[PDB]
Design an enzyme around this catalytic site. Sequence first.
Site, PDB file in Angstrom:
ATOM      1  N   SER A   1     -29.657 -17.652  54.165  1.00 26.12           N
ATOM      2  CA  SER A   1     -28.764 -18.739  53.802  1.00 26.12           C
ATOM      3  C   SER A   1     -29.347 -20.077  54.255  1.00 26.12           C
ATOM      4  CB  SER A   1     -27.370 -18.513  54.399  1.00 26.12           C
ATOM      5  OG  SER A   1     -26.511 -19.614  54.119  1.00 26.12           O
TER       6      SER A   1
ATOM      7  N   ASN B   1     -10.252 -34.717  49.003  1.00 26.11           N
ATOM      8  CA  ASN B   1      -9.814 -35.401  50.226  1.00 26.11           C
ATOM      9  C   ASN B   1     -10.590 -36.664  50.588  1.00 26.11           C
ATOM     10  OD1 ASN B   1      -9.406 -32.164  50.949  1.00 26.11           O
ATOM     11  ND2 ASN B   1      -7.674 -33.485  51.498  1.00 26.11           N
ATOM     12  N   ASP B   2     -11.639 -36.973  49.844  1.00 32.05           N
ATOM     13  CA  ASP B   2     -12.379 -38.190  50.127  1.00 32.05           C
ATOM     14  C   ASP B   2     -11.980 -39.234  49.098  1.00 32.05           C
ATOM     15  OD1 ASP B   2     -15.753 -38.742  51.360  1.00 32.05           O
ATOM     16  OD2 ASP B   2     -14.207 -40.205  50.821  1.00 32.05           O
TER      17      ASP B   2
ATOM     18  N   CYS C   1     -18.721 -25.506  46.885  1.00 37.82           N
ATOM     19  CA  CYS C   1     -18.705 -25.766  45.451  1.00 37.82           C
ATOM     20  C   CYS C   1     -17.877 -27.003  45.086  1.00 37.82           C
ATOM     21  CB  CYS C   1     -18.178 -24.533  44.714  1.00 37.82           C
ATOM     22  SG  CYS C   1     -19.244 -23.070  44.959  1.00 37.82           S
TER      23      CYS C   1
ATOM     24  N   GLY D   1     -14.672 -30.264  50.567  1.00 33.84           N
ATOM     25  CA  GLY D   1     -13.406 -30.962  50.715  1.00 33.84           C
ATOM     26  C   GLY D   1     -13.353 -32.372  50.138  1.00 33.84           C
TER      27      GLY D   1
ATOM     28  N   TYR E   1     -17.334 -17.249  62.035  1.00 32.57           N
ATOM     29  CA  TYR E   1     -16.186 -17.897  61.376  1.00 32.57           C
ATOM     30  C   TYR E   1     -14.880 -17.740  62.153  1.00 32.57           C
ATOM     31  CZ  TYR E   1     -18.983 -18.420  57.069  1.00 32.57           C
ATOM     32  OH  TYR E   1     -19.918 -18.694  56.103  1.00 32.57           O
TER      33      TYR E   1
ATOM     34  N   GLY F   1      -7.142 -19.661  50.123  1.00 33.91           N
ATOM     35  CA  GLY F   1      -6.276 -18.534  50.416  1.00 33.91           C
ATOM     36  C   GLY F   1      -5.019 -18.490  49.563  1.00 33.91           C
TER      37      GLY F   1
ATOM     38  N   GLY G   1     -17.522 -29.666  47.128  1.00 32.77           N
ATOM     39  CA  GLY G   1     -17.958 -30.775  47.957  1.00 32.77           C
ATOM     40  C   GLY G   1     -17.547 -30.696  49.419  1.00 32.77           C
TER      41      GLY G   1
ATOM     42  N   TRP H   1     -22.173 -22.241  48.097  1.00 36.52           N
ATOM     43  CA  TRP H   1     -21.041 -22.624  48.936  1.00 36.52           C
ATOM     44  C   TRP H   1     -20.809 -24.137  48.890  1.00 36.52           C
ATOM     45  CZ3 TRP H   1     -21.777 -25.587  53.432  1.00 36.52           C
ATOM     46  CH2 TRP H   1     -23.092 -25.683  53.907  1.00 36.52           C
TER      47      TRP H   1
END
Lengths: 293, 293, 293, 293, 295, 295
Positions: free
Chosen positions: D158, D219-220, D211, D215, D55, D264, D213, D209
């Site tokens: 994962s 944002n779409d 959760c 973004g 990451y 964050g 979409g 993860w």
Amino acid sequence: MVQRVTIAPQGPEFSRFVMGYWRLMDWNMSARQLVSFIEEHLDLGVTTVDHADIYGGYQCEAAFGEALTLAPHLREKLQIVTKCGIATTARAENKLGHYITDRRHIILSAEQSLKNLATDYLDMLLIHRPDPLMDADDVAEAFQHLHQSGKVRHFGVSNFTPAQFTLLQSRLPFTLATNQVEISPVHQPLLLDGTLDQLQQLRIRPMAWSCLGGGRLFNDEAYQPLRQELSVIAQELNASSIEQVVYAWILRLPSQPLPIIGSGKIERVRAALEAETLSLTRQQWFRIRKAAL
Amino acid sequence: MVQRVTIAPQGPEFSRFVMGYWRLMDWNMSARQLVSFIEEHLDLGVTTVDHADIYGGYQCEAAFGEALTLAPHLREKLQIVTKCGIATTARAENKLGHYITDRRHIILSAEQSLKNLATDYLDMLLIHRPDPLMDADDVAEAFQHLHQSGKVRHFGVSNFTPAQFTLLQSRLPFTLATNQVEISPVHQPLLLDGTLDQLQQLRIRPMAWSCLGGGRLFNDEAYQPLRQELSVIAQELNASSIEQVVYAWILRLPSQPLPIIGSGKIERVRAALEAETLSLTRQQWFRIRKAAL
Amino acid sequence: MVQRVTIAPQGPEFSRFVMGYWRLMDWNMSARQLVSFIEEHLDLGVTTVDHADIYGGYQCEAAFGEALTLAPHLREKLQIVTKCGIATTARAENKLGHYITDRRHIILSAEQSLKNLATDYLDMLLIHRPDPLMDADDVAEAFQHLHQSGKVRHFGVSNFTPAQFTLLQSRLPFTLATNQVEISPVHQPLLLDGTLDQLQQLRIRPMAWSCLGGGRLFNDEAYQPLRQELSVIAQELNASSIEQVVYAWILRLPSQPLPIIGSGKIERVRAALEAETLSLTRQQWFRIRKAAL
Amino acid sequence: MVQRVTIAPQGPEFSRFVMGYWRLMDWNMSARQLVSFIEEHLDLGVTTVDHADIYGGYQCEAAFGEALTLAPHLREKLQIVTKCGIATTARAENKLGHYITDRRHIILSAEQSLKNLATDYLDMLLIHRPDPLMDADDVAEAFQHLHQSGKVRHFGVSNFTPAQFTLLQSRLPFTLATNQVEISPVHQPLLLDGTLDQLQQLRIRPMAWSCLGGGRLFNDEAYQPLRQELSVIAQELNASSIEQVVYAWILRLPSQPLPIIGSGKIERVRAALEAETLSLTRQQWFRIRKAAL
Amino acid sequence: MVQRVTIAPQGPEFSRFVMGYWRLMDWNMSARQLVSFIEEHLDLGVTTVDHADIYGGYQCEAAFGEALTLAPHLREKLQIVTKCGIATTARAENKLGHYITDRRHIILSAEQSLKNLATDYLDMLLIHRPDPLMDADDVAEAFQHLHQSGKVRHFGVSNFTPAQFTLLQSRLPFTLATNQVEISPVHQPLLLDGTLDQLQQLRIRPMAWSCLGGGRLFNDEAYQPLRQELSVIAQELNASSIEQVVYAWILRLPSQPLPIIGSGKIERVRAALEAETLSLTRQQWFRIRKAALGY
Amino acid sequence: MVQRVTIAPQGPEFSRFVMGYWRLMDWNMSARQLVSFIEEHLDLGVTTVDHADIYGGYQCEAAFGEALTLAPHLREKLQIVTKCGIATTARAENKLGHYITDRRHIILSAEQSLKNLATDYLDMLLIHRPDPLMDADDVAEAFQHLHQSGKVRHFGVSNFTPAQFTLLQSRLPFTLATNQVEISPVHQPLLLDGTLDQLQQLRIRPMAWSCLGGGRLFNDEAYQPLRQELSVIAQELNASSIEQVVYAWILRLPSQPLPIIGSGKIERVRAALEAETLSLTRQQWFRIRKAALGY
């Protein structure tokens, strides 16, 4: 300054990059703050702005119009594009999401757009989505009325297949000025499915939406190792950010797309506009394509 | 009673609903019972009827012809549509099911149809299926001979893609009068794949088959809660049955299809015809689409 | 007489052919007429009958129970299977079709089934469809209650994937007695996708629904030339009809399915039961498979 | 505040919601600002945190470690999850993105993680992606060494399929504690493909993860009328935001997932946590599913 | 001998069967042996030959030109087709495979082809593959220049969709003379996806590659039972081999394809040409189709 | 020489590379030439050989047995694998291709195999393909009988899904010793669909067929640029040929496959065995994967 661009034969002159306002309500701006923002991207040469009746639960047009009412001199400097055709559940009479492309609805929607945006004309009106109930004769009747009255100067579509495009075009005595479609390294089917071939052939340039993958590039943890290859290429080009590389990738397409920017923060706009100066190589273009697929 | 409709430019006039005889052998009707049935749907305004050489193991055309010889006055009141192109193993020469679209076969098939139906002309002849071996010059030559001789008035196709349609049309001095295609809430891909876009553009109306899902709506336990959403919309429209709502759903398409009824029971025909008076809203139309998907 | 068959280890004895009542309301029978029909298929050895709470807009169970109330002696001679898990819009509180597989709903549905059918026990209860919200612990709590009280003798599922099957099984101290699935020449994916492999492996025989293609075999004009190959094979076998060939095709499967008959007319039932005596060859079985695909 | 949950048999105790740090470099936080943020979500009961070696171009672990050296008392209050298995081109040795699941790499990666995070143990280590070159004996040997030395308490995977999961599990003396997978209204195939069926069967709860979409939800532009149906359900539940409704949608799954929060901004975290108190009905759950499809 | 055919309106005249040289380097022929092989298929009536800049790691064109240099009279007797547009990692500067369809690359590729093949004109030049970066104006400029100078006589494409074909065609003052595409019983989507419909409509005949399934018919164990159904139909037709049956199957298509033969064995070329005389019926054609799909 | 490997728990010991004889009839070998070829791959350590009743139109087994009859000492030195389950139209009674997995057919097929191969036992017998009509009890009865009499030593399957594999296994008192499946850079779905996961889990090693793409790698023009990326990695490894690279790629899989070689040229067999010593790195393996997919 951003380049000036004629998007279609006998079509309007737009800025190569378009400012998108579909997220305007999420930016939490006052009318006064919005005015400053418009003034800021205007000074960089972004004159073309993109709206739709449904955006922001049917509120973005009105909010934009409040800014235009504060600063009346800005209208003349902008090209306003808006859309109709979608009906969402943000309105109580719509019990489910669907499409409406009947003559009267198109005329009423455009007229409402004029009221919301506080202006007496639109530069371009688009059919927002291809509707299975679309009667091309009826859309043409609406467009003709709006055109002959001077309320809408140009017309186009959004997310149409080439057969849907050709159907509507066959009814209109002027050229459909665009087909607004999704293009990015994250979503590449239109590059080969015939949509972008048709547009290049007719010399009609698409307005490109979701240029950054509809949020996936930065927020989809699964594209995190892909962010990396855009970074590697960014440093080869001495580009300041990966957004500039993605925009350059799109500009490189021979249909010559006009990318729609959706960020309500101004030097991510400025950062975007630096893509005009990056010369991508073919190998860099294909490296991006394959890293994404 | 049932509306009269011109199906294409320079095309024939048909009834809006078409009586399909593909199941005729299953109805177990005497020739005189069939005569009564034809008279019954004629009295309702259903004048266009749909046949094919292959139906009922190559028996339905001849059975229909038995009725027409008993009642010669009926022919002038009917528009007869039949087809050719498929070869099934109900004939001993055909060791496997395949297609045959060669010039001599088309002519001989049309000629046999005339003999079977006891008439000296057909209102329309269709190519039944797109054949990967279809030579469009060959078909055109067959059609030209049938046309000039007065044996066949009009020509069309069935289940063709837009490219197959365009290919055949390019060879013909006259317009193909239809593309007979499958359309229902249960089978919707043609709504968006370009087939119906092309027909609307050319102002050619499709004859629609499997309107009730090829039996699935009533006989597939899987669509049984779906059958229930049609019942809810039926109650809203005060429709006596759900097939009425389905037919209204198809009529609502902007390609303006002519649905084919396949039931040998006259009250199911009449029930169908009241669909013309049904006022389906856009939201009702889209609810039906969603419930079927 | 129809063969007697144990469908699972420590599972119940059923008739190899099952009478399905999902269409009971469409048959327009009186209670007295239904009694005669049950008596008729009982005398042919069809003892096992298939119901569900939702069938007929939640009315078939009740209608069947009216017959059982007229003729109380019939209960003992029948094996009654019914289902729960689906919620349709035939009930006003269900605003959309969905699934409910919570403990209390399963218990309440079973108990309502006992009231509708006018009996104090069910032979088998099935989960009608795999529910993404299915909590296997909660289903198991319901099954245990219904079992320990004597209200339901056996339990199974319907339309489950092998992983969904194994999940529920892992919670139950007895064997799931069936997985009721769609099998026909028209719908063959379960032959190779693992569903029928699992059932054979556990020696659990599926009840097979939509055996005649959910109506497509006879009513989907596109399967008309396929009706032909079943006809050709029918004559090789000197079978009276193509239904008998299709049932024989299903019986030939090594999971040894129990076909569900859905016709409310009795010698189409009798015609079905003649499939027990047809010995299909492998080449005949594969010829059918390929003619359908 | 946030519920405590045991994620597997013999597994660790985690907070129901997990704080994900994959975007940490984008937040532009000082080490002291990050310390305040950790304390803030700790005070809300969010104690489990999610990392990976890759990451932020291999930078997020080290940044998090800077916070832990400034505030050593925090480690005991946290459960740290990190991963290995992916090799990106942010490292010069990697000329292309690929996978590495060899025994020595796993051990060295875990050891580097400890150094980066300034701690002498990890609560859990995951294989990040299924690797077609994964030798399960090799992984098992690595896990065994990490376990016996006390460097890693638990192990999981994962994005594994049920077969990949079973393969690795077969080599391990202890239970794999999770399968971290993508779950949202926007990405639902795992609901039915067997992945979540297997986890529920084994009583292993997945960390979830993307959760929201990845973004797309915000944002779409394409999911913007969908965002509106969540708003309608939000108003019904009197939820302050739609992400609350999305998180409640995921929590409703019978595999009982632990959603990973990636924001964050501390007020977006708190907003998320009130999803635990939301009473989502089945019909609401299914309306959301339908509107997303 | 092999029939001659006009492949398009205003188009060149080709032999109905085309000798393909993409495998030339693998044949391990001396330049003199290649001369003899060319002369041998020439004698059978095979005059059209198919090349590309990339074949054999950018080596096949030059190997062919060495034969033409030893026997310069052969040049006039051939129709030479070559291609450009693909960039492979056989060239060090290409770090990944990709496409290049810019104007100057097309011009420079054709000119290298001329030098390689040791000839001053090409009969036809093709765009090898559709390039998402293809700018049709740029290709048209290149084609215009090459046509203006006599260096290239005709132009076409390979593996284009109908929309890609129409795009390029819109820019050209002359008809695209072919769309070279994949056709076999093993690979049939172009039969129904509009590619072959468009070609028949425009009266443009496709050159067909991978006629024998790209090796699969003979080399893929999974087609051995199918291979044996072709043998049954071969026997019915008294055909010497199954290759004849497959070629006959392709020829039966109403787009009237020109099959590209890729075998460096003159024995097998001869056995290909015999397909012209085979009477494949409809039921045989459909039996073949179905054996290949499983229909 | 080629390493020897135990293919399954309680399973036989095979050579890591397997000589496949499905193309035997096309090689045009006399029985004496076949003897020499067998002796030559035997010398290199290739002891396991792969047959099937249907191969070469039901002819390859018998052609092999003619060689064994001329050289009967060879029999003990080989592990012979054969198969049944497919019915092709090479037999007149089969009017269409289909499957036959009934008990008596399996028994009669194995016994015909014994007569054809001129030997009294088979090392392994496989079900050639999953049959929707497969009754696992019936197969188990056949396998039981064949095992009881010494006619067949071990049993396996070919092209089975994991659920088909588990079904058959449930009925057997001995471990299925392989699932023979298709693996190449050209055909990769089994890498991630659970087939190879199951085999690794059970510690059963698959025999791999169509290792070179069923002919496509060399004979399909569309893989020529890919073929050239394999040549780049070959050079990096100082590999004599790209076949070595592809075989090395397959061997790298953690299911530890046994590649079946199908070339009747001992030169090419030798060039296959050299893959055992190739150091294919992860990045090279992944570069190969991606060149083949386009990833």
